Structures are given as C-alpha cells and as structure tokens.
Amino acid sequence: DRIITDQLDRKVTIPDHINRAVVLQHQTLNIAVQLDATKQIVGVLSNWKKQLGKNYVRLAPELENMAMPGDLNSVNIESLLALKPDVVFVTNYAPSEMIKQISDVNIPVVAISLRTGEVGEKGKLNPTLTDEDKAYNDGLKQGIELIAEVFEKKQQGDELVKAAFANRKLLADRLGDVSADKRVRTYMANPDLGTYGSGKYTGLMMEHAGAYNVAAATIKGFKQVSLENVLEWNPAVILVQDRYPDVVPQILNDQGWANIQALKDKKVFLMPEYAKAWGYPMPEALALGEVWLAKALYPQRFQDVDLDKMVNDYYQKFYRTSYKPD
C-alpha cells in the first residue's frame, strides 16, 4: 500500500494500484480525463453532465455509461459497494457524515480542494484566504500531483502542471501597466442570480487578464445575489460559463438588466469551454482561459498570440482530440 496526504491534510492508505476509483467531484474528474486515467474509474458524481456541461461527453464518451453512486455532498453506499471501488475522491467540503459513510465500509477517501491556504478553511465550501492567488496556484499544482500519483500518471501530471502555468508570464508582462482604476469591471452571471464573490478562482482569472470581479469585495464565495446588487455594481462586461449557455439569452431578453453598462454595450459573452471561470482553478482555465479573456479585453496587446493553435496543441495533448467551438 501507499500513504498519501490529501487536501484536507488527511493521511490516507491506498492500494499500490488503482483501477476502480469512484470520482465524486467534477474538478478531479476533468483532471483525471486530462491525465488519460478514465480506464481506472468506475463511477462518477451523478451530476457530472450539469457540472461539466452538456458537451463534456464529447471529450470523454466513456462517461456516458459510467455508474453514479453519489454526487458532491451525498453518497449511496449500497450502490457504491457493488462497484468494488478501491478509492473515492470527494470534494473538500464533502460533509463529514458522507466521508464517515465511506470510511465505515473501509474504502479509502481522498479529498481534493485544488487549494492550499489556511488549514482551518480547507473544509469550507467558501473559504476566507489571505493569499488566494498563492493558495490556488499551489493548490492546483499539489492537487494535480496528488491525483496523478493515485492513478500512477506522474509524468503526464507534471506535463499538465507545466502546461497550466506556461502563459502566466506572458500575461503578467503584457498587462503589468494596467492600473486599478482601468482594470475592466466584470461580472460572472450563473443561473438564478448566482455569482462568485471572494475566495474563488473566478476573480483570479479576471485579475490575471486585466479585469476585476465586481462582486468580490462584498460577496463571499458562491452566492445568490439580487438584481439590485448587479445594477449597483453596473459591470462593464458580463461573462457566462460555457456549461450554462441559457444564461446569455435570459440576460439579453430580461428588461430588468437592460440599463446595465454591459447590456447597453453588448458585452455579454459566453466563455469558451476551456475558459472555466469557476470557483476552482482548472489547468486549461489558466493556460487557455486567461489568454482568451486577456485577448478579448486587450486585443491590440495580443495579436501575435495564436490562441487557436495554443488551444489545439493543448486539446490534442490532454484531451486526445481537437477543440470544437460551440
């Protein structure tokens, strides 16, 4: 057996090889797909299509007939035992009762947060972080490393970490003169007036591409806000996650939103599939997503940056297919 330390700082003993993992978190699932580890998985969170988007199955068709013995915050132990799993990956904020259900039937559990940060916050859905940039940078690298070790994908893990961060220098250099008063005020609109505030990767993706998350000063993590909040914030640009494409026509056809600066300016954009401004960092969101948003908002600073090729090279390497725009 092997002992690892997971992202809740739990020491976990696992078999020397894993071939029957159950992955109850979409972030770790997308990593495992990019580590070419799916033949070693036999169940996944039951809300995988919602959380990954309806087109995710294109990149991992093997997910379609995958068993679903739990989701992010619940598990069905009788369904889970029939799969004969050798490990379950859970999200960092999985309730203690759920982790205990799985530990009580002697199946190892590995909690993934993709964040370091303050120890007392490691289990919290919406953390308070004194250095969120460092916590998410180091946490994405530590997380990818951990998932790759469990699946014995070390070399591809190392390549995935190096790819995630390969463009950060370009953006730091090209956008280093953007002052706080000029940074582009941007808002992430999720279904049902949901947004992300502080302690999340969303605002980091915006910062690295010369923008600022208008909600992050007053909202903590992922919350439902009111229409009045968004009118007050009056963002210049509204972004929608690719997995929730219905949110764009919703906003565009909603008279209550019409006087917001982004509406008036026709700056309501569905982000690409790779450009995940999610509450958790994903390697493609750093590598490709931040470059997309930087080019969208400062096109005249990036004309030499062939993003189509960057995206193709990345997709052929980690998803073993081309990118397909929707």
Ligand code: MOO
């Ligand atoms: O799907 Mo998330 O919780 O926005 O990373």
